[PDB]
Motif scaffolding. Structure first.
Motif, PDB file in Angstrom:
ATOM      1  N   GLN A 491     -11.937  43.950  -3.362  1.00 20.29           N
ATOM      2  CA  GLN A 491     -13.088  44.816  -3.155  1.00 20.29           C
ATOM      3  C   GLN A 491     -12.811  45.772  -2.003  1.00 20.29           C
ATOM      4  O   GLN A 491     -12.241  45.380  -0.981  1.00 20.29           O
ATOM      5  N   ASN A 542     -18.716  37.224   5.844  1.00 19.31           N
ATOM      6  CA  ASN A 542     -19.005  36.580   4.568  1.00 19.31           C
ATOM      7  C   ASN A 542     -18.843  35.068   4.663  1.00 19.31           C
ATOM      8  O   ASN A 542     -19.635  34.316   4.082  1.00 19.31           O
ATOM      9  N   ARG A 545     -21.676  32.981   5.638  1.00 24.46           N
ATOM     10  CA  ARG A 545     -22.788  33.113   4.702  1.00 24.46           C
ATOM     11  C   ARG A 545     -22.434  32.485   3.363  1.00 24.46           C
ATOM     12  O   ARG A 545     -22.840  32.969   2.301  1.00 24.46           O
ATOM     13  N   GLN A 547     -19.350  31.888   1.589  1.00 23.76           N
ATOM     14  CA  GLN A 547     -18.487  32.700   0.726  1.00 23.76           C
ATOM     15  C   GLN A 547     -17.066  32.158   0.860  1.00 23.76           C
ATOM     16  O   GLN A 547     -16.324  32.549   1.764  1.00 23.76           O
TER      17      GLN A 547
ATOM     18  N   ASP B 206     -20.701  43.092   3.022  1.00 27.39           N
ATOM     19  CA  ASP B 206     -21.060  41.856   2.342  1.00 27.39           C
ATOM     20  C   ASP B 206     -20.604  41.929   0.890  1.00 27.39           C
ATOM     21  O   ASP B 206     -20.947  42.872   0.170  1.00 27.39           O
ATOM     22  N   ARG B 208     -21.460  40.399  -1.674  1.00 28.19           N
ATOM     23  CA  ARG B 208     -22.555  40.467  -2.635  1.00 28.19           C
ATOM     24  C   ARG B 208     -23.113  41.880  -2.735  1.00 28.19           C
ATOM     25  O   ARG B 208     -23.521  42.310  -3.820  1.00 28.19           O
ATOM     26  N   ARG B 211     -20.476  44.006  -4.655  1.00 30.32           N
ATOM     27  CA  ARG B 211     -20.434  43.651  -6.070  1.00 30.32           C
ATOM     28  C   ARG B 211     -21.546  44.335  -6.856  1.00 30.32           C
ATOM     29  O   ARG B 211     -21.408  44.550  -8.066  1.00 30.32           O
ATOM     30  N   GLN B 212     -22.642  44.704  -6.188  1.00 29.47           N
ATOM     31  CA  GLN B 212     -23.736  45.382  -6.877  1.00 29.47           C
ATOM     32  C   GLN B 212     -23.321  46.741  -7.421  1.00 29.47           C
ATOM     33  O   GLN B 212     -24.006  47.281  -8.297  1.00 29.47           O
TER      34      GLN B 212
ATOM     35  N   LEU C 221     -30.625  41.540  -0.636  1.00 26.16           N
ATOM     36  CA  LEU C 221     -29.849  40.319  -0.475  1.00 26.16           C
ATOM     37  C   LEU C 221     -30.615  39.347   0.410  1.00 26.16           C
ATOM     38  O   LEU C 221     -31.146  39.738   1.455  1.00 26.16           O
ATOM     39  N   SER C 226     -27.917  29.618   0.521  1.00 22.43           N
ATOM     40  CA  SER C 226     -28.166  29.132  -0.825  1.00 22.43           C
ATOM     41  C   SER C 226     -27.851  27.639  -0.916  1.00 22.43           C
ATOM     42  O   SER C 226     -27.387  27.013   0.041  1.00 22.43           O
TER      43      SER C 226
END
Ligand SMILES: C1=C(CCNCc2ccccc2)CCCC1
Ligand SMILES: [Mg+2]
Lengths: 777, 214, 238, 45
Positions: A491, A542, A545, A547, B206, B208, B211-212, C221, C226
Motif C-alpha cells: 500500500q 497500525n 491498533r 494490525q 492507517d 484501513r 484500503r478504502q 474508522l 476490535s
C-alpha cells in the motif's frame, strides 16, 4: 481588520442589506471573514433605575423600569445599587448561558457577549428603552481581511472609498476644522534620515490626561478591537482607525532639546511602552532628542516619553514614514502594532496635516490646552512619486480577453481617485492618488478595471497552442511502478519528510542529520536521511491498533547530509522504499500465517528491478540498521542503487516490531529509460545438461554461475541453479549445488562431442578453482 | 488517495499539452522569493510559518522553483504543471501549480481553463466564483471558489496573470510574451472529492483508511 | 508548419486503464501474445462441439478460416508452437477480440467482444532451488484471476461453469450482479491429451468488466479495538 | 513488441490533445469503402 458597520455607513450608506455590503467588499478584493452583531440576540430587556434596597446580607431591592410599578428583584450583586442605573432582565430566558416573589436577576456586566458584577450604566438612564438600542448592541462588526497591496483600506476612510465606488456614491467625508495657534511655544524638528520625508509636530500644554473617554469613541475603538487606556492614546487610536494615519503623543516635559527623527545608534538601548527593553540597530528608525531616544519611529513609543497621569505638556507627532524604511523592524522585536502594520503597507502621505487637525480638534473638544503652531519638517521630492501611467485601450482588451467600454474604464479609475486625461484619442494618462501604493504599471490599472466592472463579467475563453509531438524515450513510468508494487501487495504511504532525530540515530548512529531551525515538534525536527525514519512510526501506528500485517511503499525524497560541510552539499534524491511486517499473504485456508524470509523479499525486489530492465548484482550490505547476515546491497555497474534485507533484530526489538523487511532504491535507477535490440533465434533444438557440485559453504552461488558461463563459452546459452542440498551426506561447512546448463547452437544441431568437451572443461575449472567434487548427469 | 487525486488533476493537463515538472523540496531564497517579484523584507515573507535552516535555505512553501528554473532555461511556449509536497508551520501538504507562457494569453482564457478544470475534476456542473486577491507574481490575480457543502463558498485554488517583472527577471520579454498561472492544494481537492473531513488521516497512513481507496 | 487547437480539458472518469491491466498481468508472470483473429474450425469444434463459428468466404488456409469464438482457438497453437520447441513453461495473455456468433440469424447479430485471455501451462514460477517445479492447481490460478479482478475494483461471485472445453469440477463462472463476465479453470483433461498440452489453465474476461470505472467513498474508522472470534463448523462437503 | 510500438506512436498524440479511438474489426461496405470515395477477407456481399 474589524470595523463597526454603523461607523462605516456614516461615511457611505449604500441603502442595501448588511449581507450584500460584505459581499461587495469580498468581491472587491477585501474578503469579509465574519459579519456578526456586537452582542448576541436576547429578549427585550431594559436598563432600569434602582429605587430602594431592603438590606438582608444577597440583597432585596426595587428597580424602576419606567412602566407601572417598580419590580422586586433579589440579587447578590455587590456593585453600587440603591439608586443606580443598571441592566436587568424583566422576564424570560435568553442569556447565552443562563435563564416579593423573585422575578429576574439584576443583569451582570458579563454573560451578554460584550464586556465587577452588575455594571450600572453611566448616566442618561432610558425608561423602558431596549438596552440593545441604548448601547447600539445591534451594530455589526465587519472582519475585513486586507491583502498587503491595499495599504489604504486599513481604515474607515479606506473602506468607505471602496463601498462608495462599487455603489456609485460619494463619501460623506466629515469636514474637519483646523485649530488656530493661540500660543507660540513650538519645538524644533530635524530629519536626519530619508525614511521620514514628512514630519508634523504640535505642542499642546495643560491637557486633562486623566478624564474624558466619550461613549461614542470608546465603542468605535472597542468594536475595532482597540481597548481604552488614557485619553490621548484613545484620540490617536481613533484617528488611526478613522483616516488611516497613526499618531502618537509625547510627554513634553521629558523631551530635552530638538526632536530628531534619525537612524538608531548601534545597539542603542530603549525601554518601550510595554516595559520591554530592546537594543536597536542602525537599520531601525527612531524618534530621539539631543540626548536620549524617545520612540521607535512608527512602531511603538518609549516608556520614558509616555504620557502618564502626571503629564501637563504634550508634543503631538503626526508623520509619514516610508514603508521601505519600516518593513520588518516591528517583527524583529516581536511587535505587531496598529501603527507598524499600517506604515509597512503604505499610509497616505497627504494625511499628516489632516490627521493633525483632526486629533487637535478632538483634543480641544475633549481636553483643554493652548495649541501652538504645527512644525512642518518636510523633505519634498523624497515623498512617494505618483507619476502618470500610460494606458491604452488595446492593452486592457488583450490583457482581460474581453472588451470593456471606454466609458467604464475612465469612470472606474476616476472614482478610485485617479486623474485620467484622455491624451490624443483612445489613449489615457492616469495619475494615481496619494493613498494608493499599488499603482505603478499599466497592469495595476487594468486589474482596477476588472475589480470595479466585476470579476463575474470576465468572459470565458480557451488558450490556443501548437500541437507538437514532444520528445519521449521509452522508460519505466512512475505510474507503471505503482501498479507493479501494488500487485506485489504493498500500500502506498506518504510520510512526513521530517522525522525524529532519536529514531534517525537509532537506525544509523553515525548519521549527520539535517535539522530544522524552527521544528514543529521534537519528532518532526530532522529531515529524513532514510524513508524508514518516517515510515516506521506509521508501521507502529497500525500495530498499536491490532494490525498483524502491514506492507508499505513510499515514493518520496531522502536528504543525504552525510560528510557535508555546508548546506548546499545536500543531496535530495528520490527513493522508493519498502516496509513489510507480517505474513507475505493474507490469512487464508492455504497455510498458517508466517512471516517472509530473505528470499520472499528478494523475489519481490528482483521483480521490481526486472520490471524496469535493471540488471543488478548483490553484495553484502553494511547499513547499521540491517541484519549483517541477511542484508544485500544492490549494485548496478558496480555502484549501489539501493539495498534490501532484514531489520537488525536488536533495533527490531527496541521498536517493538515483528520480523520486518526493509528496502530502498533510487528512483533514477528503477524508472530508467531502455532500448531493446532484437537478436536472432535458432531453428535448432537445445541440449540440457546438469552439474552437481560439492563446494565450500562460503562460495557465493553467483560467483560459481558467472564462472560456469565464462568457461562454458558461446555454445552455453543459459545456466540456472535448480537445487541446493545441506542435509545428510554433506560435511558441515560445505553444500551440494545442482546447476542446469542449457546448450544452444545458432546454425546447427549440437554434436555430443562439443557438449562433452564443454562439460569436461567446466568441471575441470570448478575442480581446480574451488576444490570441489562434481558430477555430470 | 492524495496521489490518485494528484494523478487525476495532472492527466487533464498531461494529455492536453502540459508536461509534468518536478524539483527539489529544499530551496534557497532567490528561486522562492526574489525571483517572484518579492523585494525581500516585503510583508509577503512571513518567516514564522515557513520552515528554514539557515537564512537563505528553507523548505518549499509552493512549487515555484521548478517554474522559475523552467523560465530561466527554456523559452516560451511553456506549458507545465508542477505537483509536489510543500511545507508550512501549522505541516506537509501537496499542491499542483500550473504555468502557461505563450506569445499571448488573457484573463478570459485563464477563467475558462480553470472552469472546465473544476467541472471535469469534480464531475459536476459547479457554481464557481472568481474573487480578486493579491499575489506579488500576478496582476490581475484572482481566487476561485466552488459552492460546496451547503451553499458555502470554499476556496479551491488561486490564479492570476504572470507579473511582467517575473517574466523579465527570468529572461522572457514581458512585451512579446504573456502568461498566466494557478495553484491548488491537493488535500483540498482530495477531501472535497472523497468526502474526507480530517486531513490528518492522509499522513497517519492507517491501512484501513488506505484500503478504502482500493 | 504546425496545426493549432484550443487547450480543452476532456472529460475523464477514474478507471482501470488498459495499460495498467497489462502491467498487472505482466507482474503476475504472463507474456502478451497476439494471435490471429481467425483460427481452425476443427479446433474451434474441439473446444465447443456446439459452436457455430463465423466462417470466412475466402480464407487463405483451412487453419485460418473460422473467426475465433474464443481466444483459445488461436492461443493454443501458439502454446503448442513453444511446447514443441523444448519449452516446459509458457504463459500467455491477449487483448483480445472474440466473435460471438451462436444463436444468430444474421451477420448483423454478430457480437465482437474485447476480452482478456489467460493461458498457462507448466509450473507457476520458473525452476529454482526453492522447490521442484510443479504445475499450478486451481487456487493458484484463481489467486491470479482474483487479483486481476481486484485491480479493477470488481466485485465477483463464483459459480460452477458448464463450458464444454473445461474440467467441470475445477472451472468457475465469473458473475457480477448475477450475469457472467467470463470464466476460469483448467482445460478438460480429454482436450489436453488430444492437443498434447499436459495441464493447462485457461481464463477469459470481458474487458468492459475488468477495465471498468470506479468511485471511492470514505467511511469513518472506529477508534476503539476490535474483537477476534473463532468458529469451527463440521459440515458436509456439498 | 507491436504493443509497445503502438503505445509509443499513440502517446505522442494522446499527450498532445489527440484521443485513441477503437472499433469493431468486422465492418460493412459503407464504412470501409463507400464513404471513402471508392484481395479482401469478406464474409457475404
Ligand atoms: C507563477 C509562479 C508562482 C508559483 N505558485 C503558483 C500560483 C499562481 C497564482 C496564484 C497562486 C499560485 C511561478 C513563476 C511564474 C508565475
Ligand atoms: Mg493591484
Amino acid at each position: 481588520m474589524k470595523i463597526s458597520e454603523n461607523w462605516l455607513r456614516t461615511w457611505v450608506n449604500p441603502a442595501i442589506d448588511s449581507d450584500t455590503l460584505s459581499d461587495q467588499l469580498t468581491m472587491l478584493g477585501l474578503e469579509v471573514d465574519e459579519l456578526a452583531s456586537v452582542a448576541k440576540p436576547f429578549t427585550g430587556v431594559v436598563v432600569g433605575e434602582v429605587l430602594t434596597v431592603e438590606q438582608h446580607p444577597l440583597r432585596v431591592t426595587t428597580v424602576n423600569i419606567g412602566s407601572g410599578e417598580p419590580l422586586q428583584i433579589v440579587c447578590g450583586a455587590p456593585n453600587v445599587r440603591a439608586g443606580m442605573k443598571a441592566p436587568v432582565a424583566t422576564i424570560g430566558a435568553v442569556l447565552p448561558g443562563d435563564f416579593v416573589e423573585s422575578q429576574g436577576m439584576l443583569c451582570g456586566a458579563s454573560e451578554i457577549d460584550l464586556e465587577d458584577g452588575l455594571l450600572e450604566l453611566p448616566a442618561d438612564a432610558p425608561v423602558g428603552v431596549n438596552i440593545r438600542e441604548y448601547l447600539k448592541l445591534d451594530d455589526n462588526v465587519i472582519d475585513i481581511s486586507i491583502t498587503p497591496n491595499r495599504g489604504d483600506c486599513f481604515s474607515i476612510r479606506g473602506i468607505a472609498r471602496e463601498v462608495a465606488v462599487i455603489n456609485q456614491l460619494q463619501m460623506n467625508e466629515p469636514e474637519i476644522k483646523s485649530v488656530d495657534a493661540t500660543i507660540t511655544d513650538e519645538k524644533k524638528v530635524v530629519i536626519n534620515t530619508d525614511g521620514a520625508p514628512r514630519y508634523l509636530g504640535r505642542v499642546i500644554k495643560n491637557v486633562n490626561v486623566k478624564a474624558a473617554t466619550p461613549e461614542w469613541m470608546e465603542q468605535a475603538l472597542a468594536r475595532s478591537g482597540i481597548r481604552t487606556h488614557s485619553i490621548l492614546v484613545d484620540v490617536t487610536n481613533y484617528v488611526l482607525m478613522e483616516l488611516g494615519q497613526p499618531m502618537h503623543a509625547f510627554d513634553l516635559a521629558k523631551i530635552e532639546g530638538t526632536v530628531h527623527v534619525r537612524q538608531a545608534k548601534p545597539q542603542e538601548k530603549l525601554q518601550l511602552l510595554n516595559d520591554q527593553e530592546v537594543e536597536l540597530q542602525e537599520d531601525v528608525m527612531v524618534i530621539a532628542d539631543d540626548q536620549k531616544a524617545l520612540a521607535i519611529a512608527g512602531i511603538m513609543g518609549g516608556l520614558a516619553s509616555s504620557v502618564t497621569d502626571d503629564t501637563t505638556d504634550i508634543f503631538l507627532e503626526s508623520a509619514f514614514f516610508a514603508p521601505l524604511a519600516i518593513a520588518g523592524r516591528a517583527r524583529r522585536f516581536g511587535l505587531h502594532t496598529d501603527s507598524s502594520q499600517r506604515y509597512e503597507r503604505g499610509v497616505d502621505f497627504e494625511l499628516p496635516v489632516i490627521a493633525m487637525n483632526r486629533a487637535s480638534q478632538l483634543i480641544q473638544e475633549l481636553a483643554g490646552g493652548e495649541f501652538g503652531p504645527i512644525t512642518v519638517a518636510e523633505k519634498s521630492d523624497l515623498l512617494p512619486k505618483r507619476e502618470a501611467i500610460e494606458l491604452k485601450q488595446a492593452q486592457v482588451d488583450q490583457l482581460l480577453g474581453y472588451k470593456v467600454a471606454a466609458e467604464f474604464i475612465t469612470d472606474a479609475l476616476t472614482r478610485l481617485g485617479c486623474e485620467v486625461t484622455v491624451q490624443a484619442n483612445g489613449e489615457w494618462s492616469v495619475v494615481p492618488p496619494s493613498h494608493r501604493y499599488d499603482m505603478a504599471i499599466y497592469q495595476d490599472l487594468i486589474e482596477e478595471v476588472a475589480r470595479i466592472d466585476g470579476y463575474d463579467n470576465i468572459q470565458i475563453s480557451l488558450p490556443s497552442m501548437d500541437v507538437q509531438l514532444a520528445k519521449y524515450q521509452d522508460r519505466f513510468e512512475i505510474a507503471q511502478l505503482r501498479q507493479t508494487v501494488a500487485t506485489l501487495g504493498y500500500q502506498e504511504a506518504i510520510s512526513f519528510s521530517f522525522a525524529d532525530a532519536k529514531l534517525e540515530k537509532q537506525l544509523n548512529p553515525q548519521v549527520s542529520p539535517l535539522m530544522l531551525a524552527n521544528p514543529i515538534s521534537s519528532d518532526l525536527a530532522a529531515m529524513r536521511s532514510t524513508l524508514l525514519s518516517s515510515l516506521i512510526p506509521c508501521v507502529q501506528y497500525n500495530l498499536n491498533r491490532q494490525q498483524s500485517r502491514v506492507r508499505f511503499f513510499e515514493l518520496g525524497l531522502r536528504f543525504d547530509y552525510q560528510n557535508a560541510n555546508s548546506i548546499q552539499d545536500l543531496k535530495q534524491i528520490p527513493t522508493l522504499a519498502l516496509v513489510a511486517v507480517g505474513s507475505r499473504e493474507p490469512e487464508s485456508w492455504h497455510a498458517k500465517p508466517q512471516p517472509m524470509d530473505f528470499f520472499d523479499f528478494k523475489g519481490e525486489v528482483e521483480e521490481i528491478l526486472a520490471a524496469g530492465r535493471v540488471k543488478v548484482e548483490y553484495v553484502r550490505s553494511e547499513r547499521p540498521w540491517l541484519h549483517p547476515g541477511q542484508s544485500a546491497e544492490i549494485l548496478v555497474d558496480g555502484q549501489s542503487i539501493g539495498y534490501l534485507g532484514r531489520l537488525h533484530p536488536s533495533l527490531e526489538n527496541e521498536l517493538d516490531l515483528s520480523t520486518t523487511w526493509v528496502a530502498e532504491l533510487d528512483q533514477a535507477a528503477v524508472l530508467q529509460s531502455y532500448v531493446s535490440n532484437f537478436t536472432e533465434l535458432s531453428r535448432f533444438p537445445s541440449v540440457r545438461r546438469d552439474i552437481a557440485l560439492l563446494i565450500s559453504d562460503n562460495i557465493n552461488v553467483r560467483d560459481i554461475q558467472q564462472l560456469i558461463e565464462k568457461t562454458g563459452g558461446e555454445l552455453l546459452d543459459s545456466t540456472w541453479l535448480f537445487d541446493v542440498y545441506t542435509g545428510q551426506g554433506v560435511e558441515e561447512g560445505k553444500r551440494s549445488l545442482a546447476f542446469a546448463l542449457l546448450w544452444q547452437h545458432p546454425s546447427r544441431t549440437l554434436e555430443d562431442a562439443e557438449i562433452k568437451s564443454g562439460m569436461d572443461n567446466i568441471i575441470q575449472v570448478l575442480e581446480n578453482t574451488y576444490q570441489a567434487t562434481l558430477r555430470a548427469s | 488517495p492524495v496521489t490518485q487525486v494528484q494523478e487525476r488533476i495532472c492527466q487533464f493537463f498531461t494529455k492536453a499539452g502540459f508536461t509534468v515538472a518536478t524539483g527539489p523540496e529544499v530551496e534557497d531564497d532567490y528561486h522562492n522569493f526574489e525571483a517572484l517579484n518579492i523585494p525581500g523584507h516585503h510583508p509577503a515573507r512571513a518567516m514564522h510559518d515557513t520552515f528554514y535552516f539557515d537564512a537563505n535555505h528553507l523548505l518549499r512553501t509552493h512549487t515555484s522553483g521548478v517554474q522559475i528554473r523552467t523560465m530561466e532555461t527554456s523559452q516560451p511556449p511553456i506549458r507545465i504543471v508542477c505537483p509536489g509536497r510543500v511545507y508550512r508551520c501549522d505541516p506537509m501538504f501537496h499542491q499542483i501549480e500550473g504555468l502557461y507562457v505563450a506569445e499571448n494569453t488573457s484573463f478570459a482564457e485563464l477563467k475558462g481553463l480553470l472552469i472546465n478544470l473544476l467541472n471535469e475534476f469534480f464531475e459536476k456542473d459547479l457554481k464557481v466564483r472568481f474573487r480578486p486577491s493579491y499575489f506579488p507574481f500576478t496582476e490581475p490575480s484572482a481566487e476561485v471558489d466552488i459552492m460546496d457543502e451547503r451553499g458555502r463558498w470554499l476556496e479551491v485554488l488561486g490564479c492570476g496573470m504572470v507579473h511582467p517583472n517575473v517574466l523579465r527577471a527570468a529572461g522572457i520579454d514581458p512585451d512579446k510574451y504573456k502568461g498566466f498561472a494557478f495553484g491548488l492544494g491537493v488535500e483540498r481537492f482530495a477531501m472535497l472529492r472523497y468526502g474526507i473531513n480530517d486531513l490528518r488521516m492522509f499522513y497517519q497512513n492507517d491501512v484501513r483508511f488506505l484500503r478504502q481507496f482500493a
